[PDB]
Scaffold this motif. Sequence first.
Motif, PDB file in Angstrom:
ATOM      1  N   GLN A 166       0.830  -1.206   0.000  1.00 30.93           N
ATOM      2  CA  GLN A 166       0.000   0.000   0.000  1.00 30.93           C
ATOM      3  C   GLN A 166       0.858   1.247   0.000  1.00 30.93           C
ATOM      4  N   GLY A 167       0.358   2.302  -0.645  1.00 29.06           N
ATOM      5  CA  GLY A 167       1.037   3.593  -0.646  1.00 29.06           C
ATOM      6  C   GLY A 167       2.188   3.735  -1.624  1.00 29.06           C
ATOM      7  N   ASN A 168       2.543   2.648  -2.307  1.00 34.17           N
ATOM      8  CA  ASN A 168       3.666   2.656  -3.246  1.00 34.17           C
ATOM      9  C   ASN A 168       3.238   2.733  -4.724  1.00 34.17           C
ATOM     10  OD1 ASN A 168       6.431   1.662  -1.611  1.00 34.17           O
ATOM     11  ND2 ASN A 168       4.494   1.119  -0.611  1.00 34.17           N
ATOM     12  N   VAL A 169       4.038   3.410  -5.547  1.00 32.30           N
ATOM     13  CA  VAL A 169       3.978   3.249  -7.004  1.00 32.30           C
ATOM     14  C   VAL A 169       4.935   2.134  -7.351  1.00 32.30           C
ATOM     15  CG1 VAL A 169       4.814   4.136  -9.273  1.00 32.30           C
ATOM     16  CG2 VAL A 169       3.502   5.662  -7.783  1.00 32.30           C
ATOM     17  N   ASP A 170       4.428   0.995  -7.789  1.00 28.56           N
ATOM     18  CA  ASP A 170       5.232   0.210  -8.724  1.00 28.56           C
ATOM     19  C   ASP A 170       4.391  -0.682  -9.636  1.00 28.56           C
ATOM     20  OD1 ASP A 170       7.754   0.359  -9.818  1.00 28.56           O
ATOM     21  OD2 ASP A 170       8.594  -1.325  -8.701  1.00 28.56           O
ATOM     22  N   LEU A 171       4.189  -0.132 -10.821  1.00 27.63           N
ATOM     23  CA  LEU A 171       3.658  -0.834 -11.962  1.00 27.63           C
ATOM     24  C   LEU A 171       4.739  -1.756 -12.540  1.00 27.63           C
ATOM     25  CD1 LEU A 171       2.324   2.509 -13.487  1.00 27.63           C
ATOM     26  CD2 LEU A 171       0.900   0.886 -12.218  1.00 27.63           C
ATOM     27  N   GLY A 245     -15.922  -3.579  -5.650  1.00 26.94           N
ATOM     28  CA  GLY A 245     -14.538  -3.769  -6.041  1.00 26.94           C
ATOM     29  C   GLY A 245     -13.579  -2.820  -5.354  1.00 26.94           C
ATOM     30  N   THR A 246     -12.370  -3.321  -5.086  1.00 31.17           N
ATOM     31  CA  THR A 246     -11.338  -2.575  -4.362  1.00 31.17           C
ATOM     32  C   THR A 246      -9.963  -2.674  -5.014  1.00 31.17           C
ATOM     33  OG1 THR A 246     -10.922  -4.513  -2.931  1.00 31.17           O
ATOM     34  CG2 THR A 246     -12.357  -2.795  -2.015  1.00 31.17           C
ATOM     35  N   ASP A 247      -9.846  -3.336  -6.174  1.00 25.43           N
ATOM     36  CA  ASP A 247      -8.511  -3.691  -6.719  1.00 25.43           C
ATOM     37  C   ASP A 247      -7.678  -2.455  -7.035  1.00 25.43           C
ATOM     38  OD1 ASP A 247      -9.177  -6.882  -8.492  1.00 25.43           O
ATOM     39  OD2 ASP A 247      -8.982  -6.422  -6.340  1.00 25.43           O
ATOM     40  N   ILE A 248      -8.276  -1.477  -7.735  1.00 19.08           N
ATOM     41  CA  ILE A 248      -7.569  -0.234  -8.088  1.00 19.08           C
ATOM     42  C   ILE A 248      -7.084   0.486  -6.823  1.00 19.08           C
ATOM     43  CG2 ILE A 248      -7.657   2.028  -9.267  1.00 19.08           C
ATOM     44  CD1 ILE A 248      -9.729   0.797 -11.233  1.00 19.08           C
ATOM     45  N   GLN A 249      -8.010   0.762  -5.893  1.00 24.07           N
ATOM     46  CA  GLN A 249      -7.712   1.386  -4.593  1.00 24.07           C
ATOM     47  C   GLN A 249      -6.602   0.633  -3.824  1.00 24.07           C
ATOM     48  OE1 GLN A 249     -10.918   0.620  -5.628  1.00 24.07           O
ATOM     49  NE2 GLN A 249     -12.379   2.197  -5.001  1.00 24.07           N
ATOM     50  N   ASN A 251      -4.183  -1.239  -5.005  1.00 27.21           N
ATOM     51  CA  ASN A 251      -2.882  -1.373  -5.669  1.00 27.21           C
ATOM     52  C   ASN A 251      -2.538  -2.808  -6.161  1.00 27.21           C
ATOM     53  OD1 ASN A 251      -0.607   0.108  -6.589  1.00 27.21           O
ATOM     54  ND2 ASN A 251       0.665  -0.717  -4.909  1.00 27.21           N
ATOM     55  N   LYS A 252      -3.556  -3.519  -6.632  1.00 30.05           N
ATOM     56  CA  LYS A 252      -3.440  -4.939  -6.965  1.00 30.05           C
ATOM     57  C   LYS A 252      -2.868  -5.237  -8.334  1.00 30.05           C
ATOM     58  CE  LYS A 252      -5.155  -6.484  -3.255  1.00 30.05           C
ATOM     59  NZ  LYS A 252      -4.189  -7.112  -2.350  1.00 30.05           N
ATOM     60  N   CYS A 253      -2.124  -6.333  -8.417  1.00 30.33           N
ATOM     61  CA  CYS A 253      -1.664  -6.864  -9.674  1.00 30.33           C
ATOM     62  C   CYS A 253      -2.807  -7.634 -10.380  1.00 30.33           C
ATOM     63  CB  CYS A 253      -0.431  -7.755  -9.434  1.00 30.33           C
ATOM     64  SG  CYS A 253       0.335  -8.291 -10.960  1.00 30.33           S
ATOM     65  N   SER A 254      -3.787  -6.880 -10.859  1.00 34.11           N
ATOM     66  CA  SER A 254      -4.989  -7.411 -11.508  1.00 34.11           C
ATOM     67  C   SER A 254      -4.685  -7.784 -12.946  1.00 34.11           C
ATOM     68  CB  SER A 254      -6.095  -6.335 -11.482  1.00 34.11           C
ATOM     69  OG  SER A 254      -7.240  -6.739 -12.205  1.00 34.11           O
ATOM     70  N   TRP A 255      -5.490  -8.670 -13.532  1.00 33.18           N
ATOM     71  CA  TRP A 255      -5.375  -8.943 -14.976  1.00 33.18           C
ATOM     72  C   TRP A 255      -5.534  -7.650 -15.765  1.00 33.18           C
ATOM     73  CZ3 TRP A 255      -8.647  -8.693 -19.346  1.00 33.18           C
ATOM     74  CH2 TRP A 255      -8.239  -9.466 -20.447  1.00 33.18           C
ATOM     75  N   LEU A 256      -6.466  -6.796 -15.323  1.00 35.53           N
ATOM     76  CA  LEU A 256      -6.782  -5.536 -16.014  1.00 35.53           C
ATOM     77  C   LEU A 256      -5.586  -4.597 -16.084  1.00 35.53           C
ATOM     78  CD1 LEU A 256     -10.389  -4.694 -14.682  1.00 35.53           C
ATOM     79  CD2 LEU A 256      -9.747  -5.331 -17.012  1.00 35.53           C
ATOM     80  N   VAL A 257      -4.878  -4.438 -14.973  1.00 25.14           N
ATOM     81  CA  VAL A 257      -3.707  -3.553 -14.965  1.00 25.14           C
ATOM     82  C   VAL A 257      -2.548  -4.123 -15.790  1.00 25.14           C
ATOM     83  CG1 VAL A 257      -2.346  -4.207 -12.877  1.00 25.14           C
ATOM     84  CG2 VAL A 257      -2.513  -1.716 -13.617  1.00 25.14           C
ATOM     85  N   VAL A 258      -2.382  -5.445 -15.795  1.00 26.10           N
ATOM     86  CA  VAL A 258      -1.310  -6.089 -16.558  1.00 26.10           C
ATOM     87  C   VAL A 258      -1.577  -5.922 -18.065  1.00 26.10           C
ATOM     88  CG1 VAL A 258      -0.089  -8.238 -17.111  1.00 26.10           C
ATOM     89  CG2 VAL A 258      -0.628  -7.743 -14.732  1.00 26.10           C
ATOM     90  N   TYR A 276      -3.246   5.089  -9.955  1.00 29.66           N
ATOM     91  CA  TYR A 276      -3.456   3.725  -9.429  1.00 29.66           C
ATOM     92  C   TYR A 276      -3.148   3.644  -7.929  1.00 29.66           C
ATOM     93  CZ  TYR A 276      -4.223  -1.331 -10.146  1.00 29.66           C
ATOM     94  OH  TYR A 276      -4.766  -2.605 -10.138  1.00 29.66           O
ATOM     95  N   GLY A 277      -3.845   2.752  -7.233  1.00 27.11           N
ATOM     96  CA  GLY A 277      -3.503   2.444  -5.839  1.00 27.11           C
ATOM     97  C   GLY A 277      -3.844   3.522  -4.830  1.00 27.11           C
ATOM     98  N   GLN A 278      -4.853   4.335  -5.141  1.00 28.22           N
ATOM     99  CA  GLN A 278      -5.303   5.415  -4.258  1.00 28.22           C
ATOM    100  C   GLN A 278      -6.815   5.422  -4.031  1.00 28.22           C
ATOM    101  OE1 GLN A 278      -2.834   9.127  -5.234  1.00 28.22           O
ATOM    102  NE2 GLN A 278      -2.456   7.666  -6.900  1.00 28.22           N
ATOM    103  N   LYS A 279      -7.222   6.013  -2.902  1.00 25.50           N
ATOM    104  CA  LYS A 279      -8.617   5.885  -2.406  1.00 25.50           C
ATOM    105  C   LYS A 279      -9.604   6.881  -3.033  1.00 25.50           C
ATOM    106  CE  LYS A 279      -9.115   8.969   1.536  1.00 25.50           C
ATOM    107  NZ  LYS A 279      -8.499   9.946   0.570  1.00 25.50           N
ATOM    108  N   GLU A 280      -9.087   7.952  -3.624  1.00 26.50           N
ATOM    109  CA  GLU A 280      -9.932   9.009  -4.164  1.00 26.50           C
ATOM    110  C   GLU A 280     -10.826   8.468  -5.318  1.00 26.50           C
ATOM    111  OE1 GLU A 280      -6.751   9.274  -3.271  1.00 26.50           O
ATOM    112  OE2 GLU A 280      -6.522  11.069  -2.084  1.00 26.50           O
ATOM    113  N   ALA A 281     -12.145   8.647  -5.196  1.00 25.21           N
ATOM    114  CA  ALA A 281     -13.099   8.164  -6.201  1.00 25.21           C
ATOM    115  C   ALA A 281     -12.733   8.664  -7.589  1.00 25.21           C
ATOM    116  CB  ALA A 281     -14.531   8.578  -5.839  1.00 25.21           C
ATOM    117  N   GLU A 282     -12.314   9.924  -7.680  1.00 25.81           N
ATOM    118  CA  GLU A 282     -12.015  10.548  -8.972  1.00 25.81           C
ATOM    119  C   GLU A 282     -10.760   9.985  -9.641  1.00 25.81           C
ATOM    120  OE1 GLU A 282     -11.795  11.955  -6.049  1.00 25.81           O
ATOM    121  OE2 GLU A 282     -10.021  13.264  -5.902  1.00 25.81           O
TER     122      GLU A 282
END
Lengths: 334, 334
Positions: A166-171, A245-249, A251-258, A276-282
């Motif tokens: 959580q809280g990290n950028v790593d795509l 759903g919570t995957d984006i919020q 920070n998950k390695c989802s099929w969609l993000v891959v 990616y990986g943040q709680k803000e709805a927008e």
Amino acid sequence: AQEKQDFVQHFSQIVRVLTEHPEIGDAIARLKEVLEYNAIGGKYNRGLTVVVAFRELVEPRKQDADSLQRAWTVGWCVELLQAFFLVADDIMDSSLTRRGQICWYQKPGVGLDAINDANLLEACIYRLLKLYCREQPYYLNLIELFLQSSYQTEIGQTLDLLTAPQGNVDLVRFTEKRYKSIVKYKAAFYSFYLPIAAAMYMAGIDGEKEHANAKKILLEMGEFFQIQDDYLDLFGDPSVTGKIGTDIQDNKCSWLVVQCLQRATPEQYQILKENYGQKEAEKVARVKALYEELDLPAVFLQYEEDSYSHIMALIEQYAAPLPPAVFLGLARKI
Amino acid sequence: AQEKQDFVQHFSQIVRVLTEHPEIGDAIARLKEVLEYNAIGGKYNRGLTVVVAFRELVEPRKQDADSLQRAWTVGWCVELLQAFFLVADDIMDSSLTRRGQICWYQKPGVGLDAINDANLLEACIYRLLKLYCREQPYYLNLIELFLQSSYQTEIGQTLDLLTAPQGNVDLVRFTEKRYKSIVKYKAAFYSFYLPIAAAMYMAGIDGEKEHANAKKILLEMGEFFQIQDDYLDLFGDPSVTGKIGTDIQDNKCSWLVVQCLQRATPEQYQILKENYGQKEAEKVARVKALYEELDLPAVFLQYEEDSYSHIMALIEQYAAPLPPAVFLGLARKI
Ligand SMILES: O=P(O)(O)C1(P(=O)(O)O)C[C@@H]2CCCN[C@@H]2C1
Ligand SMILES: O=P(O)(O)C1(P(=O)(O)O)C[C@@H]2CCCN[C@@H]2C1
Ligand SMILES: [Mg+2]
Ligand SMILES: [Mg+2]
Ligand SMILES: [Mg+2]
Ligand SMILES: [Mg+2]
Ligand SMILES: [Mg+2]
Ligand SMILES: [Mg+2]
């Protein structure tokens, strides 16, 4: 449809058996509370398959009322295992709803006591196996099957959490190799191998190659079911799925993000990185907009088509000497 | 002292065995991280007992290097089980420290991912048993022993949480009957039955009456150890114990509160009612002051004396045909 009422109706026998030490009733009373919430309101596909496979694989003359009693019990064991992982996965993913109702740990008065509830669900598997199948020749095989499915799913959960700090950028973490590892382990959770293997062992089919052939069909199916789950996390209607759903919020390695990362231009990569990986709805909305711009829904539909044909091809290759109908019934739900 | 270095040194073999799928290393890397934090820094009494009992019960000529290898592994399995329950108990009790260091889930970057870590610890027990003891005649006995100890401890945790709902006044719940039920189940966690039974089965001692006799000594001991733990929660020095107490704040059915309720006047009951189960430092101080006014420390000292003599009396009655030294070594730590 035909085995359900008798599967569901056994639940009462399940709760009785554990309860019968005035003490122990209280704990089974809470197990009862926990299952009535957490293993009641599902489609019971995994649990029912033990029975459906039992009746396919054991000759009718061998299907006495006690062997059925043991089969219903083992199907419920599969449902307890699933509930164990779900109760805990929802705490860890910070989820809101499951099966259209508030997640168990979100219930006032439950909270992190749901950690113990989950562990109790798991403990009750092995007690019921002992109480129903201890004198049976397949007893050890079934203990090891549950223990091994649970191990595989657990490694999956561990890799899921490790790839999604959580809280990290790593795509950069979100590679096709990484996803293929995670899903292989997560598939154990969806695979119908556990209930079909159980019925096999109960039928006296214990050959290693026959188990390996079935496991191989069923694992590819489990992988599709996880990719579908990843897709439905964002593009599913919660009123159909029963869960937000919570995957984006998260920070998950989802099929969609891959799939996104494989198709994104450098600027599209920057939009993903910033959102990616943040709680803000927008910010979540921005990621969803990007996925749609990349035609990821169309890509999923095509993957689903390709994957269905492949699973059918594996059934044609690997089913024998089991009846193809063992595998095809489950495939009907693809 | 004499078996420790070789017990502790095996840890490296334990981690190797699970690791040897490039994927799976990562998960064992986190297991490794989790154990190095959560199963390193203890006194290892429970794990070491498997070995110490092994050497007492198997004739030296039968104590080959591979059977020792299996014994070290089973002792570590006892340490994994303990860590499983502790990782999760600390989340649920909202604890700060254990073993003088911050609880694992309080570590930044861990949090509720500690739920999965705990489950991974538990999963690794049964893998190591499979990898080391699968071809052995006692294999099923040991699986069932771990599963049963885990069940008993789990029921204990469930009754503990049920008797201690947060935010509520009920000292009415805190009866001598209720405490005796909770502790019977919690004692499974402390009892040296699990590691001594394991070594027994490994020695080919599998008779039900011999197991029941040993279980009976060891359970009474486990109950004392839980009462001591309840006492030390408040009256222990954290620098000796390694942990900050939370029982008063958490509204627990402690031995201390049950003894208080049995000796309190009506006004003293009102002080307890107004102050128990709350987070304010000054309210906890009030409860501690009351316990001291009731001479609860003196009452504990006398209970400890009475309980030691009773356990020794049970050893005299129930040890045969096992060497009394099996039981007396452990009793030396009372
Ligand atoms: O939360 P779910 O039900 O979507 C999920 P996951 O968190 O995406 O991974 C939980 C389930 C159990 C473990 C394997 N995945 C399935 C799907
Ligand atoms: O937190 P501990 O270590 O004092 C405790 P408990 O919360 O008091 O109950 C946790 C341990 C595992 C379960 C049984 N009790 C022992 C003691
Ligand atoms: Mg989830
Ligand atoms: Mg998850
Ligand atoms: Mg999902
Ligand atoms: Mg505690
Ligand atoms: Mg506790
Ligand atoms: Mg304590």
